[PDB]
Design an enzyme around this catalytic site. Structure first.
Site, PDB file in Angstrom:
ATOM      1  N   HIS B   6      91.418  33.971 -13.154  1.00 54.22           N
ATOM      2  CA  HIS B   6      92.219  35.132 -12.783  1.00 54.22           C
ATOM      3  C   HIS B   6      93.666  34.921 -13.206  1.00 54.22           C
ATOM      4  O   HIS B   6      94.293  33.929 -12.819  1.00 54.22           O
ATOM      5  CB  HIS B   6      92.134  35.372 -11.279  1.00 54.22           C
ATOM      6  CG  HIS B   6      92.457  36.776 -10.870  1.00 54.22           C
ATOM      7  ND1 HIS B   6      93.738  37.286 -10.895  1.00 54.22           N
ATOM      8  CD2 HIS B   6      91.664  37.777 -10.420  1.00 54.22           C
ATOM      9  CE1 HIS B   6      93.718  38.541 -10.480  1.00 54.22           C
ATOM     10  NE2 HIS B   6      92.472  38.863 -10.185  1.00 54.22           N
ATOM     11  N   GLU B  73      96.483  42.793 -14.157  1.00 52.82           N
ATOM     12  CA  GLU B  73      95.593  41.690 -13.822  1.00 52.82           C
ATOM     13  C   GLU B  73      94.511  41.531 -14.884  1.00 52.82           C
ATOM     14  O   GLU B  73      93.958  42.519 -15.377  1.00 52.82           O
ATOM     15  CB  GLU B  73      94.958  41.905 -12.447  1.00 52.82           C
ATOM     16  CG  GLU B  73      95.962  41.870 -11.303  1.00 52.82           C
ATOM     17  CD  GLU B  73      95.309  41.698  -9.945  1.00 52.82           C
ATOM     18  OE1 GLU B  73      94.081  41.899  -9.840  1.00 52.82           O
ATOM     19  OE2 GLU B  73      96.028  41.362  -8.980  1.00 52.82           O
ATOM     20  N   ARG B  89     103.626  47.373  -8.076  1.00 51.00           N
ATOM     21  CA  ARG B  89     104.517  46.950  -7.005  1.00 51.00           C
ATOM     22  C   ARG B  89     104.842  45.467  -7.114  1.00 51.00           C
ATOM     23  O   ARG B  89     104.373  44.786  -8.031  1.00 51.00           O
ATOM     24  CB  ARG B  89     103.881  47.238  -5.645  1.00 51.00           C
ATOM     25  CG  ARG B  89     102.422  46.813  -5.573  1.00 51.00           C
ATOM     26  CD  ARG B  89     101.977  46.561  -4.150  1.00 51.00           C
ATOM     27  NE  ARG B  89     100.557  46.242  -4.079  1.00 51.00           N
ATOM     28  CZ  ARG B  89     100.069  45.012  -3.994  1.00 51.00           C
ATOM     29  NH1 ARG B  89     100.863  43.954  -3.979  1.00 51.00           N
ATOM     30  NH2 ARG B  89      98.753  44.840  -3.924  1.00 51.00           N
TER      31      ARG B  89
END
Ligand SMILES: CC(C)(COP(=O)(O)OP(=O)(O)OC[C@H]1O[C@@H](n2cnc3c(N)ncnc32)[C@H](O)[C@@H]1OP(=O)(O)O)[C@@H](O)C(=O)NCCC(=O)NCCS
Lengths: 96, 275, 180, 96, 96
Positions: B6, B73, B89
């Site tokens: 990730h 992401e 954000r």
């Protein structure tokens, strides 16, 4: 004269107040140095302090409002000075 | 996908069409869906993969003319990377990109909303080809989640508290102080620990030293778990997958920090009140 | 090499060093005075030892022999002296290596070269470095004072400030007075 | 049996101890779990606790003498838990 | 002017601009590490550089309205700052 006992700047209101009440004003400003703007506490707090376990809010200033809890008060020690255990805005503070 | 990594990428736009990226951060150290450790940048990533992933972010983020701070992401498997979601954000772990790139992420938000150009004088964002990373940052969120009870949040009164610091340690203050009663209504975070160095191993050594120097009694805490995650060779290798907690058993075990200083106080208290 | 480390200091630098020591997995020992019984630093370390119940607040961090006592029983390896106490004391730096205690700092002679106000100045000139011109030692004659002023040029600071030469007279006598 | 009960190493001393006094040896283990090693406490403190205003030192480990002070006790709260105000090693600790 | 053969109180700022741990190195020199070996791992003098500017403030109880005479007594409240760009080195200040 009044510019001497104080830190300098004095307003005309102070001048006329001294001449109407000499000792009351000299006493007033002394308490002003001690306790802050006393007129901001609610009447029950101004007259009775705080009961054990009680929280109380003091609007010290516009939006500035501190949340004071009295946790416990100790026995007097030698010299007769008690310790007061406060909770002020979540944090902990002791007062003699 | 299968055994990936990730990886987020931090972009920042202004209200005039100028967007820059402060590179990536690794968040592969996850137990459940929530992330527990994030490192900036990734150690096990090739400079080629890092660039294609960063350029993928800039492509998306400029094609839609995103404004202000944001995050793209990515999951990474081998040479192939893919896109999952965008968080428009601040993220909890923006602090570590702030630490290794030098740009104040939250402050840049405020001036962007005001209307300051990215490369103006108030922001003075470096030109993109000049943005770089110096060192390696690691962020720990110290929480009250019992690492030995499915990470269930402990609620109670912190009776003692002590933060660390010094060279290489940056703290972000949460609900952690002496006398706080941690409410069960919010995420149970006490303080944001974040280190830095010139290596990712000096940052590990720095991180455990502060995790140890920490002192929080009166409530449970996930410090010993976060300590194991740090000290494990599978973590300091630089390459770990989302399947890392699951793959590593020795992380959950924790020797209980005997609270000698408090237990003594607790005993004397009982026999004083109860005889 | 360094397996245990003792900090011959208190306060911020002890904590500073403990954090550095426990980053290289070095076991840390602290010393404290009776006045620092409540100090914050003596539990940033693994163990903590009183200098001795018979020492005042400054004695506790300057007693070379009892500091050596506490370290030897602490079977410690090195000593970091920090700053401001025995940090540059060659006698402490001599006593340490006498006891197989690695003194964390400079070699013994370095403490000597840089310990006094004139010896440091001398090694500085030997290495081709500019130095503030001064009298070779202290002086008690106006004649040597005027000898230095017509060789060093003004201003001039006399102690134990002068710009125009008409002041070098009345000022050189004033210091000789108060110094006397 | 004993190794799993404490989830840790065990000496022979523990083994004969449990074999000779089972329900007693295990009861002591609960107490070392709760309060630690009490044998290190001085006898008067172990029997009577501490009095308000009493400073006391207890060595719990090598070079780890912790200095304790009892300052005051609170009136019991809604449930029945009192607050004790300590001063361990110069920093203030509270415990219910 | 002079040379102090010891680490200095203002060393913190030199660590943040350059990037090297001064006190850490000091320990590994007495441990005999090579200044360019794995332990100290110092970058070459050409590759030593500074990034940005650092400032240090020693907060003290010296009253700046009373000839900097170190006030003493009891700190009854203590809050420390932090966040991006701030480094704290704890000294004598704490809640009590
Ligand atoms: C393991 C360790 C971190 C404490 O963990 P524990 O097993 O939970 O605690 P212990 O039972 O050893 O100690 C409990 C009490 O000992 C006392 N104590 C610890 N070190 C002390 C010292 N050097 N001198 C005097 N008292 C000390 C404190 O009152 C501590 O209470 P708190 O930790 O609840 O505030 C220990 O190694 C230690 O000395 N800690 C203090 C120093 C520290 O934090 N070092 C981290 C690296 S900077």
């Amino acid at each position: 004269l009044l510019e001497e006992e104080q830190q300098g700047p004095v307003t005309e209101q102070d001048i006329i107040s001294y001449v109407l009440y000499p000792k009351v004003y000299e006493q007033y400003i002394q308490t002003r140095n001690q306790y802050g703007n006393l007129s901001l506490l609610d009447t029950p707090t101004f007259f009775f302090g705080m009961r054990n376990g009680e929280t109380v809010e003091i609007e010290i200033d516009k939006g500035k409002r501190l949340i004071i809890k009295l946790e416990t008060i100790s026995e007097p020690d030698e010299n007769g000075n008690r310790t007061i255990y406060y909770a002020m805005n979540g944090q902990a503070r002791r007062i003699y | 996908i299968d055994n990936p990594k990730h990886i987020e990428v931090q972009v920042i736009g202004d209200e005039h069409g100028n967007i820059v990226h402060l590179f990536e951060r690794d968040c592969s150290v996850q137990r459940r869906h929530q992330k527990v450790v994030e490192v900036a940048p990734s150690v096990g990533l090739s400079p080629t993969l890092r660039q294609r992933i960063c350029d993928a972010a800039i492509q998306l983020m400029e094609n839609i003319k995103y404004v202000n701070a944001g995050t793209v992401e990515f999951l990474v498997s081998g040479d192939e990377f893919f896109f999952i979601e965008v968080n428009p954000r601040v993220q909890v772990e923006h602090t570590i990109t702030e630490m290794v790139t030098g740009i104040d992420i939250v402050k840049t938000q405020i001036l962007v909303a005001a209307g300051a150009d990215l490369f103006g004088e108030e922001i003075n964002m470096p030109q993109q080809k000049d943005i770089t990373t110096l060192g390696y940052a690691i962020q720990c969120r110290i929480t009250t989640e019992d690492p030995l009870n499915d990470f269930m949040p402990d609620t109670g009164t912190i009776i003692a508290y002590r933060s660390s610091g010094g060279f290489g340690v940056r703290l972000d203050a949460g609900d952690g102080f002496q006398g706080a009663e941690i409410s069960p209504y919010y995420d149970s975070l006490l303080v944001k620990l974040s280190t830095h160095a010139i290596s990712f191993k000096q940052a590990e050594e720095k991180m455990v030293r502060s995790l140890r120097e920490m002192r929080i009694r009166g409530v449970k805490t996930n410090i010993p778990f976060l300590i194991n995650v740090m000290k494990n060779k599978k973590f300091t290798s630089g390459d770990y997958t989302t399947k890392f907690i699951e793959e590593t058993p020795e992380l959950f075990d924790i020797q209980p920090s005997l609270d000698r200083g408090t237990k003594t106080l607790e005993y004397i208290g009982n026999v004083t009140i109860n005889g | 090499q360094i397996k245990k480390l003792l900090v011959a200091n208190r306060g911020e630098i002890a904590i500073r060093i403990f954090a550095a020591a426990a980053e290289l997995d070095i076991s840390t020992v602290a010393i404290y005075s009776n006045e620092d019984k409540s100090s914050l630093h003596r539990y940033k370390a693994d163990e903590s030892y009183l200098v001795g119940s018979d020492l005042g607040p400054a004695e506790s961090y300057l007693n070379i022999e009892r500091i050596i006592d506490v370290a030897k029983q602490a079977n410690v390896d090195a000593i970091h002296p920090g700053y401001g106490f025995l940090s540059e004391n060659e006698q402490f730096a001599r006593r340490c290596a006498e006891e197989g205690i690695k003194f964390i700092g400079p070699h013994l002679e370095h403490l000597d070269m840089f310990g006094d106000k004139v010896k440091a100045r001398t090694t500085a000139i030997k290495a081709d470095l500019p130095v503030i011109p001064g009298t070779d030692g202290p002086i008690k004659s106006y004649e040597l004072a005027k000898e230095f002023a017509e060789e060093a040029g003004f201003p001039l600071m006399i102690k134990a400030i002068v710009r125009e030469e008409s002041e070098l007279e009345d000022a050189f006598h004033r210091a000789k007075s108060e110094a006397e």
